């Protein structure tokens, strides 16, 4: 009935800038990520992932990224 995957808006934070291809590469490499896409806004990328099987810390380890877009919602 409900959606198989959930969408989460991430904020790109890093000392040195980099292309979306690299962002997609690291996120793609880690498990629990279905799709990564960058959108026209202030350094923001929308991603589709499964919270139940993916952890925030793993994403952070690959990329420092705040990973917290404005107006986001958290179950816990």
Domain count, the chain: 1
C-alpha 7/C-alpha 64 separation (Å) is 20
39, 10, 7, 40: which is closest to 26 by C-alpha?
A: 10
Technique used by the depositors: NMR
- Helix (H), strand (E), coil (C) string for the chain: CCCCCEEEEEECCCCCCCCHHHHHHHHHHCCCEEEEEEECCCCEEEEEECCCCCCHHHHHHHCCCCCCCCCCCCCC
Q: Could you list the residue range(s) of the whole structural domain that residue 73 is in?
A: 1-76
């Amino acid at each position: 009935a409900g959606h198989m995957t959930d969408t989460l808006f991430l904020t790109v934070t890093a000392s040195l800038t980099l292309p979306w291809d690299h962002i997609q590469s690291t996120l793609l490499k880690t498990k629990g990520v279905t799709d990564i896409k960058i959108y026209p806004q202030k350094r923001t990328v929308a991603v589709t992932i499964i919270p139940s099987i993916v952890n925030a810390n793993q994403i952070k380890e690959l990329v420092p990224e705040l990973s917290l877009d404005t107006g986001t919602l958290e179950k816990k």
